[PDB]
């Protein structure tokens, strides 16, 4: 989720993704640890048995056959990590996430409590306000005339620059906000 995707996946990338999916579903089928280790080592041997194929056409055919076998033999109810996109606690703590700009709307009575926090917040806001134009200029200079091909962004290169478009990545609410 953190990295900019590419225009396509390469053959090795699809191979590795299939390897990971097969291992995870085999673990879902083989609940106990020793049985899973046995069958995972068997799968790894089966997987690197065709590791040295110089013919790419046969390599893609083998990949296609492997994917067909995976789809036939997949677990209908595979294990999902609780916070993963399919887990039982995936978006559980989203309702507790509040954006930072809401703090601007607090009553001065509410801001009377926590004075040091709001002083630090003012420092951060000043930093962002000062850095914005330099970020825009750096993005303008680095980018090609046609436009940006990928979603990757450049880092800060100068003496006191901040990486462009940093405010909404740095000021993420939290993973467990409340």
């Amino acid at each position: 989720a953190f990295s900019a995707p590419a225009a396509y996946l390469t053959h090795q990338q699809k191979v590795l993704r299939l390897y990971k999916r097969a291992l995870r579903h085999l673990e879902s089928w083989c609940v106990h640890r020793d049985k899973y280790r046995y069958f995972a080592c068997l799968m790894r041997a089966r997987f690197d048995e065709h590791k040295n194929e110089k013919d790419m056409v046969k390599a893609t055919q083998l990949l296609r056959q492997a994917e067909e076998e995976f789809w036939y033999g997949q677990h209908p109810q595979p294990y999902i990590f609780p916070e993963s996109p399919g887990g039982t606690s995936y978006e559980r703590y989203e309702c507790y996430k509040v954006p930072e700009w809401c703090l601007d709307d607090w009553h001065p009575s509410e801001k009377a409590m926590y004075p040091d926090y709001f002083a630090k917040r003012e420092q951060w806001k000043r930093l962002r306000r000062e850095s914005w134009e330099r970020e825009v200029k750096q993005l303008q200079e680095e980018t090609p005339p046609g436009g940006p091909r990928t979603e990757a962004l450049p880092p800060a290169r100068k003496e006191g620059d901040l990486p462009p478009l940093w405010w909404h990545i740095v000021t993420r609410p939290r993973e467990r906000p409340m």
């Binding site: 309702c95 996430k97 509040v98």
Partner: protein, 459 residues
């Protein structure tokens, strides 16, 4: 009943003689006082109506409607003053004048003893609404909406006038008391069939009946907030009141005649409830919900039983309150984000908790949770329809499902989920908006505490 009519005509020069920064205060205070005065009309008899004079009378069917109108005026005053801040003083006074004239026309309409005076006032209610929509609406389609609001009404009501005068040449009177006491059966002839249609179709287009409802989404979406409140709360109930009044002369032709309108109403409640499930605009959803509820009321009036009439009265009052509350709720978000797209602003329960509580209560009352008067009216209508024919429980039943779906759908789309990241101008709720919601919602439960006050004359 001039003790209520005169104070509104006095509200007029008070508004036009007020200081530039005190118009809203004076209008709100004296509208609330007028509502308190009008509360005395609820002391009704058990046999006949309160006949004040030769011109005005109060029945058990019209008193709750009068109270609802006089209560709604301060709510519209409170809701309007937010988006009219930059407006000049003269135009603000003109807007308040339009609202006052509308309330005066409605008050005089709900108590006229003659049918022709009722017609004149029920048609005079058109002008202020059209002016409000076409002048203080926000987008460019408002003009078109105004046209749809106008001719759709007049094409239905011009024949009625003809029928009305024809009746007075035959029976000699249009006074509702004399009409009720000297009632005669209608024969089965083409002339009587067309008289029935002329007497009925104006009120049908006012409800509106399914297939004749195309003016309503346009008018209720393009109008300002006060216009929407008055359009959904009271102006739709004119058709029901007029139909309940006029059905006394249409028997026994009504049994044969009603069939197409009954089938249209039932299949149309199904269709409009289904339409509410796929709507990208928040105001259009509320408009179509209003159409569904009014179709239920049409069925109730058409089957012509005492239980059906009590259900129609209760449902009309409940729907007025609920629809006004929902329109105000939507307008709060619209004023925040300047857009009516429903998926634009999400997860508002995180940012506005009490506003989300108001949303929840309004959505609960929309789906007729017991023992709210919404459910009382709906259940009485359903029981009457079941007595009419046992198969109706199918269609009504389906409605009871679909309604709930879209209602909760609305809530889930607006309040739950995660907030939109790039919308950073959701200011905290004001005292005015919370007070508007509370003044909408508390009378509903208070009425539930004592339901015989809104059950009509058949009680």
């Amino acid at each position: 009943m001039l003790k209520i009519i005169i104070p509104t005509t006095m509200l007029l020069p008070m508004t036009w003689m007020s200081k530039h920064n005190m118009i809203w205060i004076n209008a709100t205070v004296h509208s609330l006082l007028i509502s308190l005065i009008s509360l005395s009309l609820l002391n009704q008899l058990g046999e006949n109506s309160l006949n004040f004079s030769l011109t005005f009378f109060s029945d058990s069917l019209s008193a709750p409607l009068l109270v609802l109108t006089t209560w709604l005026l301060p709510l519209m005053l409170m809701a309007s003053q937010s988006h009219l801040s930059k407006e000049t003083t003269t135009r603000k006074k003109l807007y308040i004048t339009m609202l006052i004239l509308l309330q005066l026309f409605l008050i005089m309409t709900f108590t006229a003893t003659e049918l022709i005076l009722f017609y004149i006032l029920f048609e005079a209610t058109l002008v202020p609404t059209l002016i409000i929509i076409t002048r203080w609406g926000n987008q460019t389609e408002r003009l078109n909406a105004g046209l749809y609001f106008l001719f759709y009404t007049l094409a239905g009501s011009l024949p009625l006038l003809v029928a009305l005068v024809y009746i007075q040449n035959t029976t000699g009177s249009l006074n509702f008391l004399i009409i009720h006491y000297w009632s005669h059966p209608l024969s089965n002839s083409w002339s009587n069939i067309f008289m029935w249609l002329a007497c009925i179709m104006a009120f049908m287009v006012k409800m509106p009946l399914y297939g004749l409802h195309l003016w309503l989404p346009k008018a209720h979406v393009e109008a300002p907030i006060a216009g929407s409140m008055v359009l959904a709360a009271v102006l739709l109930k004119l058709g029901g009141y007029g139909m309940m009044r006029i059905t006394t002369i249409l028997n026994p032709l009504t049994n044969y005649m009603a069939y197409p309108f009954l089938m249209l109403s039932m299949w149309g409640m199904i269709m409009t409830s289904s339409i509410c499930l796929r709507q990208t605009d928040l105001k259009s959803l509320i408009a179509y919900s209003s159409v569904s509820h009014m179709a239920l009321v049409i069925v109730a009036i058409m089957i012509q039983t005492p239980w059906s009439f009590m259900g129609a009265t209760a449902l009309m009052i409940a729907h007025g309150l609920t629809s006004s509350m929902l329109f105000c709720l939507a307008n709060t978000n619209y004023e925040r984000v300047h857009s009516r797209t429903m998926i634009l602003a999400r997860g508002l329960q995180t940012l506005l908790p009490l506003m989300a509580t108001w949303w929840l209560v309004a959505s609960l009352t929309n789906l007729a949770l017991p023992p709210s008067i919404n459910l009382i009216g709906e259940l009485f209508i359903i029981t009457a329809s079941f007595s009419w024919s046992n198969i109706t429980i199918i269609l009504m039943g389906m409605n009871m499902m679909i309604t709930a779906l879209y209602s909760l759908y609305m809530l889930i789309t607006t309040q739950r989920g995660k907030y939109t990241h790039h919308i950073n101008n959701i200011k905290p709720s004001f005292t005015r908006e919370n007070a508007l919601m509370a003044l909408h919602i508390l009378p509903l439960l208070l009425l539930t505490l004592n339901p015989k006050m809104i059950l009509g004359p058949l009680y």
